[PDB]
Design a binder for these strands. Structure first.
Ligand SMILES: Nc1nc2c(ncn2COCCOP(=O)(O)OP(=O)(O)OP(=O)(O)O)c(=O)[nH]1
Ligand SMILES: [Mg+2]
Ligand SMILES: [Mg+2]
Ligand SMILES: [Mg+2]
Ligand SMILES: [Mg+2]
Lengths: 265, 1064
DNA sequence: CACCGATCCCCGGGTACCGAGCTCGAATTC
DNA sequence: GAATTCGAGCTCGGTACCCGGGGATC
């Protein structure tokens, strides 16, 4: 059909609808970098870099032909290509088609909507079909390589880890990992710690023996993880870089990630 | 000797030597800054080349021409001068009180002394003879008067009948406001010493109604003697019994004229048969000024004794033959005009510059004022001479040098040499200037109402009007030039001379004196009142002539007198059927609409009857119109009962406009353009008759007549719309009325629907007819409608025929006239606001829409959808070229070369900047930034160029110092500054306003939804964003690879693969 | 002292909601 | 006793007027 065709009917739209379900308007004024391997939705929250990979396996049919494409999600700067995938924006949706049609520097994406009716047919709400144009020059700086050590957390665990973190330039935090798993997030007037094994007292992680002490400058790390309203997941550290980075990736059906820049040792 | 002491400097032996120190060649290298000052005792000297002579010594030689006969009493004419004078063009009429005790020695006849016995007012007719002689005829007689109602004054001030300056008589006039009004008995109260009436009209018994107490003595002279004009040939006549003109003796000369007479109105005749204009002289001067203070990059200020005039260009044309006769250059200090400039002058046939050198500023200005008195140019011009040049010079001459200017005009003393500026008077619409017997036609004001430019600087006007690329000297480069030797002062002298030559070229392209003089002849006002005192005195004087003939009198109302509100209901503007109309759109419109209503329906003050008793003895429909105006029933009796006065008034002016238009088809294109502007000026004087009725707290208003004019206008517009819709609704009825419609039936379904209208026009969207002979049939359509509906002077006429029209909004539309030109009507391409960049790109866009087919097809296709349906599906592929222009402008606005003259917005100051209530305007910001920097502060109706400078930390803190998103009135620099300091422009603003102009015009393509248009126009633009500086660095430190611009597609795809696995 | 009219569109600045978000902690739910 | 919609409660832009002013058009 369309030279790039990305089809999300229902029974996969409920997966993606669950991904945007964590209760966010946040990732609306974003940028979608579509291409092979899927759509990547990158946005900046408080100054931090948030990502949502959407693999090609997460659409009913994904076909992409040509160079990577970048769309502002904000269609016409009021509506948004992703406002469709909110929880209850459009109650009765059944299918969404994301067709890109054009020639590499100047492409356009169309997004169609189809809302449910009775007796097996679908109303195309043509008042609300959206058409956006590829950005046609851009650069985004995406996270790279592999983690050296990742630690998986849970919802209350990550909530208390965020609670430990500071408020202002008064309070730098510190994600020290000692020898044998004593992963710990402290500040002057707060400390949290836990053990990492590869009943209730077992977080999981990988390559935990690689001790470190990264140190966080920015208070925003708390705020970001609540804006996203993240429910816990992997906490991956990158230390083979001049400026170390911690990514934090929600462990649910979706992959919304947020990378924060750590100061050295 | 002289009976009237001469108040111009004929002699000086001591004055105030101000002069720069950089003129002093033998003086140490740093004893150069500042100026000299302080008294010096020597007669003021002028150095012309090698020679020198005193400025005020007329004698044998002379460095500038002289047309004066007297000079401080000595009679410098060749002996035996006694020219006979039989015909004498008159260009200005002065009036001045003259006391018979002052003229004991003037040796008049009896019949002038008895006309001034304590005092009289004397009407001086200034002029030329066919032989170049400056005449001055003094018309004795001619006393002002007003009327007061006999009974009203008799009861309000018991009457049973020095005290003889107020001679009175019982006349039988009738008031001009109503048809029911009866001729009462009035007293005609002859004032002399006219000023005294100004007290006795505001102050003597203010509960009586004075009738014509505002009518000056000149108007009594012009009107009381039928035929007389304020500008035209005259002739001395034998007189009532035989009384003759009494040629004065040179000591009794009141003006600087060659010959003078003492006539009365019976010794003068109008002398038609001469039409041509005599040998009158035109001065076209231009001063150049230096600032001599601590900051000599400040703009000169006349009050500061060290901010001095340095140069005065002065060209001396002949007004009739248009020949530049003299090129004078006054110069403080040595001035050697460049040989390149001298040779360009000699090449063009122009006289050689006579550069006059002076030591002191006083000597220069005294020599200029001595030239102005000696040469005595009847007409002066220049560019902005009323806001800068004459105010600078007179400020110098009166504050700094204490020179009386009352004698430097055409009278030898006690004359007016005043300049007036708007200066928060809140009624003055212009800055005036009145030198007596000298007609100052500032070409600035002549050009601002003859051409639409954003900037009216003389370089911009020279390029736009003469197509003459002049080079401008900034007032900032005059210190640096003047400080160097005489050659650089000569370079300044070149730029001064070239300024005045350009202004002479403008004057002789437009010839304002001729057009203005036609208006002054027809109105009854002198030519200086024509230049300056508005439209109401024209109408009032013409109406006063009519009234006084018909036996009426015009009551005085302002004696009983000292936003955006309206006095009555104006005109109907039908709702446009907005859109791109690719079918023919015939524009009918009434010719001289409101004048034709005033004549057709006989509207006046004298024909209105507010009460139905005055017409209780006249038939309805046959003898009087009856109209509900403002909810009030009004009866306007028809002619054959009483002719309107506004009708005959309008006859004269409509004949003038029609004769000017009857010379357009037979003229060159560049002179047809001037003729178009002249007939538009007479159109304005015709519509000001209507406007004069409806001016509240104006001279002689009647908002009943004004509201009737507009009321009948609205009924005529609707009557025309219903006639077109009813009669020609089907094509067969069009074919029955005009059989030539058979060969105009285009294939489609016919219709003829008015799609817009305005005060008079109606835009008939003729579907199914071809545009070819639609104007040929439109003349017949219009004649048919004018015959079926309206009374004879009313005349609907097919004005245009658009093959394409973009009815944007009510007073906005664009359209290409048939087979022909583009007509742009109020869509911001024709507006003085914008910057040349946006105007240029918007014009490119409308040319695409209209001229480029395949964008007109795409645009006409845009209307098959409601606007919002275009938001989803792509615009038809013809609009692609329409977006290339926008894209190009986006590109072209960011590219860093950007001479910022393309980005200069303007706005007119238009009132004292403290008279604003909303004081946060961009041009007001720049006005105060200019006054802060000692720059050239604009004047109340100037246009204030400004750029919108980029939001930078520096500008922000500067604004808070003089005191998120700053307003565009705080990012409001002026372009000279923003070039000097390379502050960079607000690209965000300028592109948002480019799209704003595109959106305002082309929302008509998208069902007039500005938002849908805005969205669809920003779709063309290539969006780009980069992770900002100081951020991509630290992200690149973290091994973040880039995906996008700076890499091959395989690297971007691959590193996204890596990122998707990492970020997973 | 000075002096044509009205209509009308756009745009900038200024105000007032208004709701749509999120957030915050405090009860309600395992 | 750890979690947790819920409901005030705020902020942050729209969106709607709305008034002055520029400056058109009749
Ligand atoms: N007081 C006043 N009223 C004016 C003014 N301008 C318009 N009107 C109103 O217009 C009436 C008819 O419009 P036009 O002048 O185009 O048509 P016209 O006068 O009938 O002349 P033509 O239609 O023949 O060009 C004006 O300056 N002052
Ligand atoms: Mg000049
Ligand atoms: Mg000037
Ligand atoms: Mg007309
Ligand atoms: Mg008209």
């Amino acid at each position: 059909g369309a030279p790039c065709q990305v089809v999300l009917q229902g029974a996969e739209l409920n997966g993606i609808l669950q991904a945007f379900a964590p209760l966010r308007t946040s990732l609306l004024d974003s940028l979608l970098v579509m291409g092979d391997r899927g759509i990547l939705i990158h946005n900046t929250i408080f100054g931090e870099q948030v990502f949502l990979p959407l693999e090609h396996s997460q659409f009913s049919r994904y076909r992409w032909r040509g160079p990577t494409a970048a769309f502002l999600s904000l269609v016409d700067q009021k509506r948004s290509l992703l406002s469709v995938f909110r929880a209850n924006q459009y109650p009765d949706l059944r299918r969404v088609e994301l067709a890109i049609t054009g020639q590499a520097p100047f492409r356009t994406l169309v997004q169609r909507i189809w809302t449910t009716t009775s007796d097996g047919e679908a109303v195309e709400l043509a008042s609300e079909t959206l058409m956006k144009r590829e950005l046609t020059s851009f650069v985004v700086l995406v996270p790279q390589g592999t983690p050296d050590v990742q630690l998986r957390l849970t919802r209350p665990q990550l909530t208390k880890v965020l609670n430990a973190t500071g408020a202002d330039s008064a309070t730098p935090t510190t994600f020290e990992l000692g020898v044998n798993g004593k992963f710990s997030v402290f500040t002057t007037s707060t400390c949290v710690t836990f053990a990492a094994r590869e009943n209730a007292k077992t977080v999981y992680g990988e390559n935990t023996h690689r001790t470190f002490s990264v140190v966080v400058d920015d208070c925003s790390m708390r705020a970001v993880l609540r804006r996203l309203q993240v429910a816990g997941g992997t906490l991956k550290f990158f230390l083979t870089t001049p400026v170390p980075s911690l990514c934090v990736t929600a462990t649910g059906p979706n992959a919304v990630s947020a990378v924060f820049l750590l100061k050295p040792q | 000797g002289p009976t009237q002491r001469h108040t111009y400097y004929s002699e000086c032996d001591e004055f105030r030597f101000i002069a720069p120190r950089v003129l002093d060649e033998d003086a140490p290298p740093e004893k150069r800054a500042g100026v000299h000052d302080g008294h010096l005792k020597r007669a003021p000297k002028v150095y012309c080349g090698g020679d020198e002579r005193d400025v005020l010594r007329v004698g044998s030689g002379g460095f500038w021409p002289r047309r004066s006969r007297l000079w401080g009493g000595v009679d410098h004419a060749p002996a035996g001068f006694n020219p006979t004078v039989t015909v004498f063009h008159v260009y200005d009429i002065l009036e001045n009180v003259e006391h018979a005790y002052g003229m004991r020695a003037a040796q008049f006849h009896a019949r002038f002394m008895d006309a001034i016995t304590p005092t009289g007012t004397v009407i001086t007719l200034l002029g030329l003879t066919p032989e170049g002689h400056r005449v001055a005829v003094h018309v004795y007689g001619t006393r002002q008067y007003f009327y007061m109602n006999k009974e009203e004054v008799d009861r309000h001030l018991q009457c049973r009948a020095s005290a003889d300056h107020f001679e009175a008589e019982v006349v039988e006039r009738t008031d001009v406001y109503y048809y029911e009004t009866r001729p009462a008995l009035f007293y005609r109260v002859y004032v002399r010493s006219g000023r005294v009436l100004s007290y006795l009209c505001d102050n003597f018994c203010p509960a009586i109604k004075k009738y014509e107490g505002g009518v000056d003595a000149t108007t009594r002279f012009i009107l009381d003697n039928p035929g007389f004009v304020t500008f035209g040939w005259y002739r001395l006549k034998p007189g009532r019994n035989n009384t003759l003109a009494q040629p004065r003796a040179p000591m009794a000369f009141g003006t600087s004229s060659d010959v003078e007479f003492n006539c009365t109105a019976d010794n003068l005749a109008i002398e038609g048969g001469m039409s041509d204009l005599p040998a009158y002289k035109l001065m076209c001067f231009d001063i150049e000024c230096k600032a001599g203070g601590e900051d000599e990059l400040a703009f000169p200020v006349a009050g500061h004794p060290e901010d001095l005039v340095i140069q005065i260009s002065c060209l001396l044309y002949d007004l009739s033959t248009t020949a530049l006769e003299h090129v004078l250059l006054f110069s403080l200090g040595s001035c050697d005009l460049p040989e390149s400039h001298l040779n360009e002058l000699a090449a063009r046939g122009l006289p050689t510059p006579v550069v006059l050198e002076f030591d002191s500023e006083f000597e220069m200005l005294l020599a200029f004022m001595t030239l102005v008195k000696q040469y005595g140019p009847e007409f002066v011009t220049g560019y902005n001479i009323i806001n800068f040049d004459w105010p600078f010079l007179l400020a110098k001459l009166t504050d700094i040098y204490k020179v009386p200017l009352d004698g430097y005009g055409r009278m030898n003393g006690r004359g007016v040499f005043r300049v007036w500026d708007i200066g928060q008077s809140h009624f003055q619409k212009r800055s005036k200037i009145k030198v007596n017997g000298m007609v100052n036609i500032d070409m600035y004001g002549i050009i601002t109402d003859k051409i639409k430019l954003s900037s009216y600087k003389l370089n911009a006007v020279a390029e736009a009007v003469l197509k003459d690329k002049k080079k401008d000297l900034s007032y900032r480069d005059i210190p640096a030039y003047y400080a160097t030797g005489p050659a650089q002062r000569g370079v300044i002298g070149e730029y001064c001379i070239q300024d005045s030559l350009l202004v002479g070229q403008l004057f002789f392209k437009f010839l304002p004196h001729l057009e203005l003089s036609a208006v002054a002849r027809l109105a009854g006002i002198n030519i200086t009142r024509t230049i300056y005192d508005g439209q109401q005195i024209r109408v009032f004087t013409c109406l006063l002539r009519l009234a006084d003939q018909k036996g009426f009198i015009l009551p005085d109302t302002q004696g009983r007198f000292r936003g955006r509100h309206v006095g009555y209901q104006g005109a109907r503007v039908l709702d446009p059927t907005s859109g791109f109309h690719v079918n023919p759109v015939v524009v009918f419109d009434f010719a001289s609409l409101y004048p034709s209503i005033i004549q057709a329906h006989n509207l006046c003050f004298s024909t209105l009857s507010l009460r139905a008793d005055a017409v209780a003895h006249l038939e309805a429909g046959k003898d009087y119109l009856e109209i509900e105006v403002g909810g009030r029933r009004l009866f306007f009796v028809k002619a054959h009962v009483r002719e309107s006065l506004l009708s005959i008034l309008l006859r004269d002016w409509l004949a003038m406009r029609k004769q000017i238009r009857s010379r357009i088809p037979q003229s060159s294109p560049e002179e047809a353009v001037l003729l178009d502007k002249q007939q538009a000026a007479i159109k304005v004087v015709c519509n000001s008759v209507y406007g004069f009725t409806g001016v509240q707290h104006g001279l002689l208003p009647c908002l009943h007549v004004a509201a009737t004019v507009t009321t009948i206008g609205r009924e005529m517009l609707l009557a025309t719309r219903e006639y077109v819709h009813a009669r020609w609704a089907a094509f067969e009825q069009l074919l029955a009325d005009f059989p030539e419609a058979a060969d105009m039936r285009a294939p489609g379904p016919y219709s003829m629907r008015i799609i817009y209208g305005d005060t008079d026009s109606i835009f008939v969207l003729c579907r199914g007819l071809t545009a070819a002979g639609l104007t040929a049939m439109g003349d017949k359509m219009a004649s048919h409608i004018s015959r079926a509906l309206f009374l004879p002077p009313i005349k609907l006429e097919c004005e245009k025929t658009f093959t394409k029209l973009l009815l944007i909004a009510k007073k906005k539309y664009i359209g290409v006239i048939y087979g022909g030109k583009m007509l742009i009507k109020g869509v911001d391409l024709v507006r003085k606001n914008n910057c040349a960049f946006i105007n240029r790109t918007s014009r490119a866009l409308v040319d695409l829409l209209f001229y480029d087919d395949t964008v007109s097809g795409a645009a006409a296709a845009l209307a098959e959808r409601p606007a919002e349906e275009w938001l989803a599906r792509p615009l038809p592929e013809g609009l692609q070229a329409f977006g290339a222009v926008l894209v190009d402008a986006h590109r072209r606005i960011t590219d860093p070369e950007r001479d910022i003259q393309d980005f200069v917005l303007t706005a007119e100051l238009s009132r004292h900047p403290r008279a604003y209530t909303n004081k946060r305007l961009a041009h007001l910001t720049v006005y105060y930034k200019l006054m802060a920097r000692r720059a050239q502060v604009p004047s109340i109706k100037d246009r204030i160029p400004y750029v919108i400078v980029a939001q930078t930390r520096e500008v922000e803190e500067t604004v808070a110092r003089l005191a998120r998103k700053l307003l565009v009135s705080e990012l409001a620099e002026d372009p000279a500054y923003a070039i000097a300091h390379g502050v960079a422009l607000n690209t965000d603003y300028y592109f948002s306003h480019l799209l704003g102009a595109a959106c305002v015009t082309f929302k008509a393509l998208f069902g007039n939804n500005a938002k849908i248009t805005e969205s669809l126009l920003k779709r063309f633009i290539p969006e780009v964003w980069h992770p900002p500086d100081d951020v991509a660095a630290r992200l690149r430190a973290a091994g973040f690879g880039a995906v996008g611009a700076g890499a091959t597609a395989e690297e971007t795809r691959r590193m996204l693969h890596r990122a998707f696995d990492t970020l997973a």
